[PDB]
């Protein structure tokens, strides 16, 4: 059998991964390994979407998030040359029991003293733009809302942000979704209380920048959220508080290409959280097998900086990848006519593998 490497444009002194295409050719006992020389290219464009909890627990957090677009760009300057930011909002589904359906409290889901907007599952406040000023202004115009139970419905908002590629404004760059909460999270099954039995189907249900289909769709499962976040090249940054740190820290163990971090009661360290999380993410590379099976098994052996070599799931991962650092991935398709797609998660830049056997 043979690597048959083709269109291997050399990694730029933008190709971050070479070969960018190859066709391996053997089957039983195949150990065909093609070194994916992954070079972290300086100044690769990044799109970011900041999904923010808008329940009353984040009333003070929203004040800090107000001036974030300009600041996040000012800080990702040193990592990328072309960056964009967008904003979304979420509180909870607009039905009982997550809110009280009294006529008096439907306008103000919180207490009488606490003025709150009527509940809304998700509102696309801003679509991706290179203008952080629009981010700041549209975030400031957002009014705090509330719900009744401690967990918040952010998973439907995450799915809505992911699916609407055109309306949100996703580009063919690395996408980051800083999902910020201070309380727990609702998920699939949490909707049975309100009689919301049909789950989040994973489509663009955004009308007038408002997820008006709250009452019809349930919060998605963590598996479906993972599928939609990975399939759309979105690296989540679960910025959550310390009271739920043993919650989202375990959550990151299941969700690929994530990096949880702790914030204060007012999310004051959200920018440092994003920077450190993306430093962990970029210095990481979870190559994906894309989707291929029944005749293909990929074993991985990374050889990253400082001589550390991983095996299996460890071998699929590299660490301590500096700016321009070259790592070698002993990617061995064991197999045991098709062109499947190998992607470093969070990267639209791709290598093409054809197992013509």
């Amino acid at each position, epitope marked *: 059998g043979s690597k048959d490497i083709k269109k291997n444009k050399n990694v730029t002194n933008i190709t971050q991964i070479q070969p960018q295409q190859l066709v391996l050719r053997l089957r039983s006992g195949e150990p065909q390994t093609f070194t994916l020389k992954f070079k972290r290219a300086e100044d690769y464009p990044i799109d970011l979407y900041y999904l923010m909890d808008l329940s009353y627990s984040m009333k003070d957090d929203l004040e800090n998030v107000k001036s974030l677009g300009t600041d996040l760009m*000012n800080e990702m300057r040193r990592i990328t040359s072309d960056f964009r930011i967008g904003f979304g909002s979420f509180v909870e589904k607009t039905v009982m029991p997550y809110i009280s359906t009294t006529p008096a409290k439907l306008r103000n889901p919180c207490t009488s003293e606490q003025n709150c907007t009527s509940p809304f599952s998700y509102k696309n406040v801003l679509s991706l733009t290179n203008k952080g*000023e629009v981010f700041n202004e549209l975030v400031g115009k957002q009014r705090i809302s509330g719900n009744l139970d401690s967990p918040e419905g952010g998973f439907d908002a995450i799915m809505q942000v992911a699916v609407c590629g055109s309306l949100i404004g996703w580009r063919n760059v690395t996408r980051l979704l800083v999902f910020s909460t201070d309380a727990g999270f609702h998920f699939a099954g949490d909707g049975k209380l309100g009689g919301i039995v049909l789950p989040n189907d994973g489509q663009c249900h955004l009308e007038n920048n408002m997820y008006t289909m709250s009452h019809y769709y349930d919060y998605p499962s963590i598996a479906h959220l993972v599928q939609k976040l990975s399939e759309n090249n979105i690296q989540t940054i679960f910025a959550v508080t310390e009271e739920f740190q043993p919650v989202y820290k375990e959550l990151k163990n299941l969700i690929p290409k994530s990096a949880v971090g702790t914030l204060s009661a007012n999310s004051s360290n959200v920018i440092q959280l994003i920077i450190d999380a993306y430093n962990s993410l970029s210095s990481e590379v979870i190559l994906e097998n894309g989707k291929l099976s029944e005749g293909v098994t990929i074993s991985y052996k990374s050889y990253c900086k400082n001589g550390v070599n991983g095996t299996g799931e460890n071998g699929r991962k590299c660490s301590n990848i500096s700016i321009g650092d070259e790592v070698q991935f002993e990617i061995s398709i064991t197999s045991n006519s098709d062109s499947f797609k190998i992607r470093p998660l969070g990267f639209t830049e791709e290598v093409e593998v054809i197992l013509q056997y």
Partner: antibody
Amino acid sequence: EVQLQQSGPEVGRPGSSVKISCKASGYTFTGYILSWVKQSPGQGLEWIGWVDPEYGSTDSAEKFKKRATLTADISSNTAYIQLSSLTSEDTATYFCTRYYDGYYRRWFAYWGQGTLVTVSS
Amino acid sequence: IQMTQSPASLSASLGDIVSIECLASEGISNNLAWHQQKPGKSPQLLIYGAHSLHDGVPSRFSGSGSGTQYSLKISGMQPEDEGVYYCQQGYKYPITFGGGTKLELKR
């Protein structure tokens, strides 16, 4: 060549409203933020604020949030600044300026010819 | 952020090299630009990204610095170099400018 053809020198009364235009040509009017940089005769540049033809949002400094009603027209590729509650002390030149692609490159690369409005009675 | 760019005004001989500094109130991470104001005309961009040169600008202009301190170095002046020079920051809002240096060549 990106050009910003502004209206002629406007004349307004103290307390009235004037609508300075900026017929932006040579670039996507909606795709780029358009800012106004007031420049009094003999003074420096003060950033009034900005318009956004894409989503319609505007944000100004603390001195122009309630006074200068900034607006943009998508169809005509023309942006307006409404000097509500004018004062004769604001007789100056108003520039419509385009950022250098935006992002952190918030540099005023392109400047219009200047609308020297003469607000007087 | 308020940029008290130095100096207020200066005059130098023909062909002399001069550095104009724009110190920022906080580290702006190379978020500084430069503009030149010819009389009766709109200002023109000279240096973007605190190091790079704008198209159509003579190569005598140069930008440097990082963090908080930045410099606008002009490799020799000419009569075409007259104008008022403003350093523009892009870190916080509102956008801030310098006081403007009157680069009037002497004779």
